Amino acid sequence: GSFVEMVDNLRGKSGQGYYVEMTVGSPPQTLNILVDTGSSNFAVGAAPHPFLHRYYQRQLSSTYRDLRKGVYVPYTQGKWEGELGTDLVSIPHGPNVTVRANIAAITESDKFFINGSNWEGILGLAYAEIARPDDSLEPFFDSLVKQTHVPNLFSLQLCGAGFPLNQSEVLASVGGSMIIGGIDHSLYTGSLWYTPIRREWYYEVIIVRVEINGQDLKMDCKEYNYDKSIVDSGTTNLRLPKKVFEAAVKSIKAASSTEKFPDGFWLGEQLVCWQAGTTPWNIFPVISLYLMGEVTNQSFRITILPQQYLRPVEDVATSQDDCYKFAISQSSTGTVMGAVIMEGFYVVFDRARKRIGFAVSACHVHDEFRTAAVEGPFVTLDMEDCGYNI
Numbered sequence: 015g016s017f018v019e020m021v022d023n024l025r026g027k028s029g030q031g032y033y034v035e036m037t038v039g040s041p042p043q044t045l046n047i048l049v050d051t052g053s054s055n056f057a058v059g060a061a062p063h064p065f066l067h068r069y070y071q072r073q074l075s076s077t078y079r080d081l082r083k084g085v086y087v088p089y090t091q092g093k094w095e096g097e098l099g100t101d102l103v104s105i106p107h108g109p110n111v112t113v114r115a116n117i118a119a120i121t122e123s124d125k126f127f128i129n130g131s132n133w134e135g136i137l138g139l140a141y142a143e144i145a146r147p148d149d150s151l152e153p154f155f156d157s158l159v160k161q162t163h164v165p166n167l168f169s170l171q172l173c174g175a176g177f178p179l180n181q182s183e184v185l186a187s188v189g190g191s192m193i194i195g196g197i198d199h200s201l202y203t204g205s206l207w208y209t210p211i212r213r214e215w216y217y218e219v220i221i222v223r224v225e226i227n228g229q230d231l232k233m234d235c236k237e238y239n240y241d242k243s244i245v246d247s248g249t250t251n252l253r254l255p256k257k258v259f260e261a262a263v264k265s266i267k268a269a270s271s272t273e274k275f276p277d278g279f280w281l282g283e284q285l286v287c288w289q290a291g292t293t294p295w296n297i298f299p300v301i302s303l304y305l306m307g308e309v310t311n312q313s314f315r316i317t318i319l320p321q322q323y324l325r326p327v328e329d330v331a332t333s334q335d336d337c338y339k340f341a342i343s344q345s346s347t348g349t350v351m352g353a354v355i356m357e358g359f360y361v362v363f364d365r366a367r368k369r370i371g372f373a374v375s376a377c378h379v380h381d382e383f384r385t386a387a388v389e390g391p392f393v394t395l396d397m398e399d400c401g402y403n404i
């Protein structure tokens with residue numbers, strides 16, 4: 015592991031997001047910032063909000079520059095409105111550099127901030143194409159690379175605890191690592207396998223095959239990427255296109271049929287509980303997603319366990335049962351490989367080589383009988399046809 019200063023710099027959990035400490039302005043104002051590979055705007059609360067105990071105070075920064083322009087950013091979940099400007103930004107547990115970056119000062123928001131998440135802003139790590147108002151607003155990572163010698167690559171190790179973290183525990187617990195400019199080998203086991211970034215907007219990838227316990231879901235692979243497939247740390251769940259979700263749920267139900275779960279569970283809205291330590295992991299299937307490889311006609315697969323797709327939640331009675339929510343849900347905007355999937359792997363966003371790497375995470379949750387996996391190669395033909403074209 016060669017990036018010790020950045021190892022263990024994240025906090026949070028899948029249900030509320032993973033965040034990194036950043037500083038903005040002069041003198042530096044410390045803020046916790048949501049790591050979001052599914053958007054491209056750097057934005058921080060800049061006005062009082064019931065869920066914020068701190069916010070960016072522009073009038074206290076000698077390096078603040080007003081762009082005299084408003085900005086509106088709508089996400090699937092919620093939205094915010096703000097005022098554009100630039101200021102000096104640093105990451106305390108990151109690369110020892112300070113850069114001048116665009117910052118949207120959030121003045122109004124709806125369903126954006128999360129009560130108790132401990133974060134006050136968002137770091138959109140995707141490409142300028144999807145930046146608001148338009149692609150001329152340079153994203154933070156682009157500025158970082160242009161202004162310093164930091165390699166055009168970052169990697170994420172999101173660490174799910176495998177159990178509920180109460181308010182105090184989640185504040186004192188290490189939630190993972192964001193390695194800026196490199197790959198830290200202590201964070202994964204086995205080999206890194208790379209899939210091409212199909213196009214530089216979201217971190218778009220192509221899924222070529224899906225298995226539930228080794229059984230082919232057997233759908234036209236274009237359905238898996240309808241209308242796109244993305245890697246998104248800013249979404250909790252694995253979200254699947256309607257038809258794929260329906261097929262996957264039918265197959266996961268069939269594999270786990272020795273126990274019947276209520277419809278509310280499969281809808282991802284209701285928790286299920288087991289007596290302490292008795293969660294029947296073995297009745298739930300593993301899920302394998304095959305991704306386009308970098309070699310012609312070659313693919314590889316990433317395999318996740320129910321310890322990834324069943325999200326630990328506190329029992330509404332706070333008892334001693336082990337409880338979970340089903341973290342796979344339906345999408346109308348393509349596949350979203352969210353945080354619960356990322357928790358099984360060390361994910362390398364190799365922007366310089368236009369590829370995303372996956373390796374088994376050194377912090378993934380598993381049992382004595384099964385482990386997450388990244389395996390290859392597999393002969394796979396006509397993978398280009400798996401991509402969707404509007």
Ligand SMILES: CCCN(CCC)C(=O)c1cc(C)cc(C(=O)N[C@@H](Cc2cc(F)cc(F)c2)[C@H](O)[C@H]2C[C@@H](OCC)CCN2)c1
Nearest residue numbers: 029030031052053088089090091092125126248249250251
């Ligand atoms: C992560 C904590 C729990 N959480 C948010 C609160 C329930 C989710 O799991 C979640 C669920 C859905 C269905 C969408 C998004 C979502 O829109 N996430 C965005 C980031 C985000 C927004 C927000 F407003 C609160 C928050 F924390 C995180 C991504 O940028 C997402 C936006 C999407 O916008 C398309 C218009 C494109 C893909 N990436 C996030």
